[PDB]
Design a protein around this motif. Structure first.
Motif, PDB file in Angstrom:
ATOM      1  N   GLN C   3      -1.585  -1.267  17.181  1.00 46.50           N
ATOM      2  CA  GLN C   3      -0.484  -0.832  16.412  1.00 46.50           C
ATOM      3  C   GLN C   3      -0.238  -2.037  15.477  1.00 46.50           C
ATOM      4  N   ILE C   4      -0.341  -3.278  15.885  1.00 44.16           N
ATOM      5  CA  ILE C   4       0.031  -4.451  14.843  1.00 44.16           C
ATOM      6  C   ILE C   4      -0.996  -4.413  13.878  1.00 44.16           C
ATOM      7  N   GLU C   5      -2.258  -3.912  13.944  1.00 44.34           N
ATOM      8  CA  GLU C   5      -3.262  -3.833  13.119  1.00 44.34           C
ATOM      9  C   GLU C   5      -2.927  -2.575  12.131  1.00 44.34           C
ATOM     10  N   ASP C   6      -2.503  -1.527  12.527  1.00 44.36           N
ATOM     11  CA  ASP C   6      -1.897  -0.341  11.748  1.00 44.36           C
ATOM     12  C   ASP C   6      -0.868  -1.036  10.801  1.00 44.36           C
ATOM     13  N   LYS C   7      -0.038  -1.779  11.199  1.00 40.34           N
ATOM     14  CA  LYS C   7       1.068  -1.969  10.714  1.00 40.34           C
ATOM     15  C   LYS C   7       0.690  -3.101   9.430  1.00 40.34           C
ATOM     16  N   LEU C   8      -0.179  -4.056   9.834  1.00 41.78           N
ATOM     17  CA  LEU C   8      -0.545  -5.090   8.974  1.00 41.78           C
ATOM     18  C   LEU C   8      -1.371  -4.354   7.735  1.00 41.78           C
ATOM     19  N   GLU C   9      -2.259  -3.197   8.046  1.00 41.90           N
ATOM     20  CA  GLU C   9      -2.815  -2.481   7.064  1.00 41.90           C
ATOM     21  C   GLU C   9      -1.566  -1.984   6.260  1.00 41.90           C
ATOM     22  N   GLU C  10      -0.747  -1.242   7.038  1.00 40.78           N
ATOM     23  CA  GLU C  10       0.159  -0.507   6.274  1.00 40.78           C
ATOM     24  C   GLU C  10       1.149  -1.339   5.316  1.00 40.78           C
ATOM     25  N   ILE C  11       1.647  -2.482   5.700  1.00 35.62           N
ATOM     26  CA  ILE C  11       2.300  -3.411   4.735  1.00 35.62           C
ATOM     27  C   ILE C  11       1.375  -3.740   3.624  1.00 35.62           C
ATOM     28  N   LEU C  12      -0.170  -4.015   4.080  1.00 36.10           N
ATOM     29  CA  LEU C  12      -0.894  -4.590   2.703  1.00 36.10           C
ATOM     30  C   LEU C  12      -0.949  -3.424   1.907  1.00 36.10           C
ATOM     31  N   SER C  13      -1.237  -2.151   2.429  1.00 30.13           N
ATOM     32  CA  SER C  13      -1.395  -1.091   1.581  1.00 30.13           C
ATOM     33  C   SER C  13       0.078  -0.810   0.592  1.00 30.13           C
ATOM     34  N   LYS C  14       0.942  -0.764   1.201  1.00 29.00           N
ATOM     35  CA  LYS C  14       2.294  -0.793   0.639  1.00 29.00           C
ATOM     36  C   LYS C  14       2.450  -1.633  -0.618  1.00 29.00           C
ATOM     37  N   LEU C  15       2.229  -2.896  -0.491  1.00 33.73           N
ATOM     38  CA  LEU C  15       1.846  -3.933  -1.100  1.00 33.73           C
ATOM     39  C   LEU C  15       1.354  -3.815  -2.418  1.00 33.73           C
ATOM     40  N   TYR C  16       0.070  -3.140  -2.190  1.00 38.64           N
ATOM     41  CA  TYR C  16      -0.847  -2.662  -3.355  1.00 38.64           C
ATOM     42  C   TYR C  16      -0.187  -1.779  -4.132  1.00 38.64           C
ATOM     43  N   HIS C  17       0.387  -0.802  -3.339  1.00 41.28           N
ATOM     44  CA  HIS C  17       1.180   0.450  -4.153  1.00 41.28           C
ATOM     45  C   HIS C  17       2.265  -0.414  -5.254  1.00 41.28           C
ATOM     46  N   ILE C  18       3.030  -1.312  -4.564  1.00 36.73           N
ATOM     47  CA  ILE C  18       4.092  -1.822  -5.216  1.00 36.73           C
ATOM     48  C   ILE C  18       3.914  -2.787  -6.435  1.00 36.73           C
ATOM     49  N   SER C  19       2.959  -3.502  -6.049  1.00 31.83           N
ATOM     50  CA  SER C  19       2.053  -4.320  -7.140  1.00 31.83           C
ATOM     51  C   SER C  19       1.614  -3.681  -8.289  1.00 31.83           C
ATOM     52  N   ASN C  20       0.975  -2.020  -7.980  1.00 36.31           N
ATOM     53  CA  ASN C  20       0.485  -1.327  -9.221  1.00 36.31           C
ATOM     54  C   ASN C  20       1.596  -0.762  -9.981  1.00 36.31           C
ATOM     55  N   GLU C  21       2.951  -0.486  -9.204  1.00 32.47           N
ATOM     56  CA  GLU C  21       4.023   0.000  -9.836  1.00 32.47           C
ATOM     57  C   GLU C  21       4.674  -0.833 -10.906  1.00 32.47           C
ATOM     58  N   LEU C  22       4.575  -2.159 -10.375  1.00 35.94           N
ATOM     59  CA  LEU C  22       5.100  -3.335 -11.231  1.00 35.94           C
ATOM     60  C   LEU C  22       4.151  -3.378 -12.428  1.00 35.94           C
ATOM     61  N   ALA C  23       2.879  -3.539 -12.188  1.00 35.57           N
ATOM     62  CA  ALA C  23       1.792  -3.428 -13.253  1.00 35.57           C
ATOM     63  C   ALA C  23       2.149  -2.343 -14.247  1.00 35.57           C
ATOM     64  N   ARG C  24       2.371  -1.180 -13.781  1.00 35.78           N
ATOM     65  CA  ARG C  24       2.529   0.166 -14.949  1.00 35.78           C
ATOM     66  C   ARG C  24       3.912  -0.425 -15.417  1.00 35.78           C
ATOM     67  N   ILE C  25       4.893  -0.836 -15.182  1.00 37.71           N
ATOM     68  CA  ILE C  25       6.187  -1.130 -15.520  1.00 37.71           C
ATOM     69  C   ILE C  25       5.796  -2.127 -16.674  1.00 37.71           C
ATOM     70  N   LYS C  26       5.121  -3.399 -16.387  1.00 37.00           N
ATOM     71  CA  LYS C  26       4.789  -4.136 -17.362  1.00 37.00           C
ATOM     72  C   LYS C  26       4.162  -3.711 -18.385  1.00 37.00           C
ATOM     73  N   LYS C  27       3.027  -2.805 -18.204  1.00 39.60           N
ATOM     74  CA  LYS C  27       2.327  -2.151 -19.107  1.00 39.60           C
ATOM     75  C   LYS C  27       3.005  -1.271 -20.111  1.00 39.60           C
ATOM     76  N   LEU C  28       3.884  -0.617 -19.637  1.00 38.41           N
ATOM     77  CA  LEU C  28       4.964   0.201 -20.429  1.00 38.41           C
ATOM     78  C   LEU C  28       5.898  -0.500 -21.149  1.00 38.41           C
ATOM     79  N   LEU C  29       6.472  -1.710 -20.785  1.00 37.40           N
ATOM     80  CA  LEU C  29       7.486  -2.500 -21.636  1.00 37.40           C
ATOM     81  C   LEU C  29       6.581  -3.373 -22.566  1.00 37.40           C
ATOM     82  N   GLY C  30       5.155  -3.618 -22.306  1.00 32.07           N
ATOM     83  CA  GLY C  30       4.485  -4.202 -23.329  1.00 32.07           C
ATOM     84  C   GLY C  30       4.274  -3.418 -24.424  1.00 32.07           C
ATOM     85  N   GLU C  31       3.962  -2.423 -24.303  1.00 38.06           N
ATOM     86  CA  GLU C  31       4.089  -1.603 -25.572  1.00 38.06           C
ATOM     87  C   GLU C  31       5.516  -1.208 -26.034  1.00 38.06           C
TER      88      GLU C  31
END
Lengths: 31, 31, 31, 31
Positions: C3-31
């Motif tokens: 369960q701890i393993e699943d949750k670390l994976e889930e946290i890491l994965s949601k963090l990838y998603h958040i990092s990419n959302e922020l990257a897209r926002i930065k890209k969009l503001l750059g333009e």
């Protein structure tokens, strides 16, 4: 655990990345 | 673990900081 | 724990998603 | 662990909060 401490280290590193992204976004927004 | 505990705390705390930065950005864009 | 393993994976994965959302926002503001 | 699994649950909940914040910011930016 060692494997849990290592994933925590990786999660923390993503957090630093996100903080950098937010630094840039803030500057792009003139904030 | 103590190190694991420190790291969970540090992750949680950086997440509070990121959540507040985002809240300030949302507040600033709202205006 | 598994369960701890699943949750670390889930946290890491949601963090990838958040990092990419922020990257897209930065890209969009750059333009 | 129980205490580690419980902190992970709390960290995950902050992540959901941040995802909500990013939903709103995106809409405020017309993205």
């Amino acid at each position: 655990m060692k494997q849990i401490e290592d994933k925590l280290e990786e999660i923390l590193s993503k957090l630093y990345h996100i903080s950098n992204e937010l630094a840039r976004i803030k500057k792009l927004l003139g904030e």
